[PDB]
């Protein structure tokens, strides 16, 4: 009978039409014959596809799911509510045979086959494999397939774009469903382990994919680290109003309206980011002042702490570094030219690692205290431990240079006050002896003064102009365009750039100094210099026992003898093995000319250094 056919289309058991729970066919024999049931098979498939799909919306009717899939269930229920509306009027009018009901439902099998194939792919890996599955059908032929694909996509993208619009006008994240690509790593160390982009979670419908990353990240940096709670409130009240009041949401916006909005919003924040790093934070003024203290660009200050601190630095690390190093730092500021310039309160000093207790000359350092100054500015440890190691290497060179010129000032008065007035006959073995010690100082003060002159101008000063000054105030490679050709955004000479590029210009500027040519079959080049500096450290330490003997040599000739001739010959014997010991450390510096020149010629970078070091 024909009236039992609408009873099966809604999934109800009659006296002869029976089925099972799931995944079974409507095997109904004995109606007329196989001639009537064979055509009845393909319309029986219309009924099993309704019941198998109705149990999917029933078991997931807004429950057991907290994701984007709860909006697709509202899509699945809307077409299912329109399906049962079509069975009612097609059976309201009286049908003659079961062929006329097959004709009106035949435009609906195209819609029903698509909803089942996407519902079968549920409770599988249901992250981005479902949102991209619907978008993979939005560009297709067969407009009944394309018609159901767009109406199932425009109302499933609204929960996804709700994460995007909060990422544009507010600068936060409301994500909980293993979704939108800006994830927060739990290791909150610096502003690099925090927000990062994964390229694999980039969808095929987001056209920008890189400006929305650099709009939400700088909004967090302009809200919590550099708070400024006046511009962000004006930014949130303006652009969220023009996104909601006239375009009713971001999903209603087309592709051209999104790129026009985001690009006009991407350069709006970077104008404000480059506003407060330069006009208020003074990034370049502090990077140049970072060089005056960590890279020894003002040698008058480093010479002052080595003169006004020659008593504290001789002791061990038992110094308090609260009233001792504060006293030495503040009086040396009055000595040198640091007492007049602006940022003198930012200058502080400390002792590094007092638990070692090696010496006081080694543990000292200088610190540029960048407190506030609302900028981090990604100047974390790996940007600072290599930035304090370079100071301590440059501290070893200025230390030896301040006890080699005092060695010149100490031996000239030793010659004058003593040696020129020694009996008029013992001067000739002594004036010959002291001319070797003053001359071996000259071989040492020329090796350091050209080693610093290579580091301070070829390595330090040339990389600062190339990496810091050129990338900030000069143009890139990078153009030529007469703008008069077609139809409150202040543009300035900073070459506007983001967070990930401000850390890289300063990160490479330190990386291109500490790792450039020689600062890292043989030992390393930095280890070869430390062996030569150890000899100069040992040459001056063995020169004071020479200086303390000659002042006693003058005391023997003033007041005068058989026992005196024994005592004089033992004292001149102290001078014989001493100048021989001075020849030992001379050939070790002559050994420096052998191994360094055999290593500098292997590189084109250090070929010029092979003739002036």
């Amino acid at each position: 009978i024909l009236t039992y056919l609408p009873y099966t289309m809604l999934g109800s058991d009659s006296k002869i039409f029976t089925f099972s729970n799931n995944y079974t066919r409507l095997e109904i024999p004995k109606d007329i014959n196989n001639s009537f049931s064979s055509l009845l098979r393909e319309v029986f498939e219309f009924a099993i596809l309704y019941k198998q799909l109705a149990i999917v919306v029933d078991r997931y009717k807004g429950t057991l799911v907290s994701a984007i899939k709860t909006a697709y269930i509202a899509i699945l229920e809307a077409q299912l509510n329109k399906y049962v509306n079509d069975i009612n009027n097609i059976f309201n009018n009286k049908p003659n045979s079961i062929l006329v009901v097959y004709n009106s439902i035949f435009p609906w099998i195209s819609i029903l086959r698509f909803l089942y194939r996407v519902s079968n792919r549920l409770n599988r890996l249901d992250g981005y494999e479902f949102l991209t599955f619907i978008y993979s059908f939005t560009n297709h032929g067969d407009p009944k397939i394309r018609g159901i694909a767009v109406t199932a996509f425009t109302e499933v993208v609204k929960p996804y774009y709700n994460i995007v619009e909060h990422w544009i006008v507010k600068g936060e994240l409301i994500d909980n469903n293993n979704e939108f690509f800006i994830i927060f790593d739990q290791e909150q160390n610096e502003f690099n382990s925090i927000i990062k982009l994964l390229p694999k979670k980039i969808p095929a419908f987001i056209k920008s994919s890189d400006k929305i990353f650099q709009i939400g990240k700088t909004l967090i940096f302009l809200n919590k680290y550099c708070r400024e709670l006046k511009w962000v409130n004006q930014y949130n009240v303006k652009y969220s109003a023009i996104l909601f009041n006239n375009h009713q949401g971001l999903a209603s916006m087309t592709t051209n309206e999104m790129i026009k909005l985001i690009d006009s919003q991407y350069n709006e924040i970077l104008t404000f980011l480059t506003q407060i790093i330069q006009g208020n934070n003074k990034l370049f003024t502090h990077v140049y002042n970072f060089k005056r203290f960590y890279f020894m660009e003002t040698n008058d200050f480093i010479d002052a702490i080595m003169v006004k601190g020659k008593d504290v630095f001789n002791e061990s690390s038992v110094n308090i570094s609260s009233t001792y190093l504060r006293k030495v730092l503040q009086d040396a500021i009055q000595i040198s030219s640091v007492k007049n310039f602006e940022y003198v309160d930012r200058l502080d000093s400390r002792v590094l690692n007092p638990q070692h207790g090696n010496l006081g000359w080694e543990s000292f350092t200088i610190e540029y205290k960048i407190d506030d100054l609302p900028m981090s500015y990604l100047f974390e440890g790996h940007q600072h431990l290599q930035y304090l190691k370079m100071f301590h290497f440059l501290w070893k060179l200025r230390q030896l240079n301040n006890l080699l010129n005092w060695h010149f000032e100490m031996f000239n008065e030793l010659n004058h006050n003593v040696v020129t007035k020694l009996s008029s006959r013992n001067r000739r073995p002594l004036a010959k002896s002291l001319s070797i010690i003053t001359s071996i100082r000259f071989h040492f003060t020329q090796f350091l003064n050209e080693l610093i002159a290579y580091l301070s101008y070829d390595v330090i000063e040339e990389n600062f102009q190339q990496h810091i000054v050129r990338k900030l105030f000069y143009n890139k490679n990078d153009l030529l365009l007469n703008k008069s050709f077609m139809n409150d955004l202040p543009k300035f000479n900073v070459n506007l750039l983001t967070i990930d590029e401000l850390v890289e210009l300063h990160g490479t500027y330190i990386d291109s100094i500490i790792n450039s040519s020689l600062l890292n079959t043989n030992i390393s080049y930095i280890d070869q210099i430390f062996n030569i500096l150890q000899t100069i450290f040992n040459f001056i330490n063995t020169s004071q026992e020479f200086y303390s003997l000659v002042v006693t040599f003058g005391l023997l000739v003033r007041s005068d003898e058989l026992e005196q001739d024994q005592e004089d010959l033992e004292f001149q014997l102290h001078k014989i093995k001493r100048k021989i010991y001075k020849d030992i450390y001379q050939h070790d510096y002559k050994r420096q000319l052998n191994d360094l020149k055999n290593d500098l010629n292997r590189d084109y970078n250090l070929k010029d250094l092979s003739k002036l070091l």
């Binding site: 020894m296 003169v307 000595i335 030219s337 070797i436 000063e461 010029d608």
Partner: protein, 410 residues
């Protein structure tokens, strides 16, 4: 970073020292009144262009007061009061208490006047030490012959040693006379005290001075070199912060303390090769003289790295070096003063060479030629000071003659 006291003695050092202090005034912004000029911003740091706070260090040569006046720490001493009035009235910022007034045409009259008023000269120097917080360098400006600066200037360099223990660096900045009856034996008497109570000497020939610039023009040429060696001191850079760091990098032996200077007059590649020419040296050169040490100043600001390095490598082959000295040509990249114009580029080379053989033997050849031709108990002390000065200048002559041959290794 101790300050530097300058001593101007003699008729030369007063007019040369006037050009030395007028050069330091315009370089540091201070005027003849003494008031300070606001410091211009250096172009090493630019601001957000829409489209007090000093980087130099003038305290080493000037003192500070409450009303921000800068007074130079110079001591003026002469016989005639006319030469002091032309120096004080030209630059009114000189301290009038440093002015001393007494003529002497001989070294004996100059050294005897240095003995009679020891107390008023030693007290005048010690008042300037009370002004500074740290003292590390004394400076002189005296004539080797001619005026009274040879006689009483020879005594003023001796009272530094007995009072302070000779721990202060003495730079003499001597001006040797041109090619006069008093001139031969005036030179040989002050040079014995010059090589005994000093630490460094920058020689300047007057007869070779007019060859460079082609008496007021001769005074401006000495002050250009004398203020150039203090350019990394006043304007702090990476190296050469103190005067002991420059000189000890230049003088290998305490008997070798004689330095020859040269002015370069463009780019900075030809500027390094122009300084190596023998015609620009203030000291006269004869044959090919081997160089011991050299320091090239580029005090006009040079943003020309990798171009200075090519000039240093080229100036190593064209200069013959002493065998026991390593071939190292050192150059300082001095910074331009922001008060002076940035258009000009200066260049100075101070160096130690063997060219002082011809200078000292020129005096010793004329020394014995006059004392044999022309020649109360005053003749005995004069004669023994001649023979003491004769054998003492020979000691640095044979030290230079033995310097060319490979020695000082036994």
């Amino acid at each position: 970073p101790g300050e530097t006291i300058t001593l101007q003695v003699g008729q030369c050092g007063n007019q040369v020292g006037l050009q030395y202090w007028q050069q330091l005034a315009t370089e540091h912004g201070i005027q003849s009144d003494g008031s300070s000029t606001p410091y211009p911003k250096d172009i090493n740091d630019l601001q957000l262009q829409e489209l007090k706070y000093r980087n130099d260090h003038p305290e080493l040569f000037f003192t500070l007061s409450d009303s921000n006046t800068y007074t130079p720490r110079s001591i003026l001493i002469d016989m005639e009061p006319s030469v002091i009035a032309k120096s004080t009235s030209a630059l009114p910022m000189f301290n009038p208490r440093n002015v001393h007034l007494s003529a002497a045409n001989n070294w004996i009259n100059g050294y005897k006047y240095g003995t009679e008023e020891e107390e008023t000269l030693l007290n005048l120097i010690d008042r300037e030490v009370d002004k500074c917080d740290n003292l590390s360098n004394f400076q002189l400006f005296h004539s080797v012959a001619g005026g009274t600066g040879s006689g009483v200037g020879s005594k003023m360099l001796e009272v530094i040693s007995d009072r302070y223990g000779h721990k202060k660096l003495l730079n003499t900045f001597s001006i040797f006379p041109s090619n006069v009856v008093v001139q031969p034996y005036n030179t040989i008497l002050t040079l014995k005290r010059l090589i005994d109570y000093s630490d460094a000497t920058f020689v300047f020939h007057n007869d070779s001075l007019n060859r460079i610039e082609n008496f007021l023009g001769a005074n401006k040429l000495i002050a250009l070199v004398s203020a150039s060696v203090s350019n990394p001191l006043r304007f702090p850079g990476y190296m050469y912060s103190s005067m002991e760091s420059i000189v000890s990098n230049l003088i290998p032996t305490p008997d070798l303390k004689f330095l020859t200077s040269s002015i370069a007059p463009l780019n900075e590649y030809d500027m390094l090769l122009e300084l190596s020419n023998d015609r620009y040296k203030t000291n006269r050169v004869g044959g090919d003289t081997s160089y011991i040490s050299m320091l090239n100043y580029l005090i006009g600001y040079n943003l020309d790295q990798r171009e200075i390095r090519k000039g240093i490598l080229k100036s190593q082959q064209r200069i013959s070096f002493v065998p026991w000295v390593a071939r190292s040509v050192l150059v300082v990249h001095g910074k331009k003063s922001p008060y002076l114009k940035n258009t000009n580029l200066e260049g100075i080379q101070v160096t130690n060479n063997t060219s002082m053989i011809d200078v000292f033997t020129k005096i010793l050849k004329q020394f014995d030629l006059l004392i044999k031709r022309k020649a109360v108990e005053e003749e005995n002390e004069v004669m023994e000071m001649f023979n003491e000065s004769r054998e003492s200048v020979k000691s640095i002559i044979d030290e230079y003659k033995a310097c060319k041959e490979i020695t000082y290794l036994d």
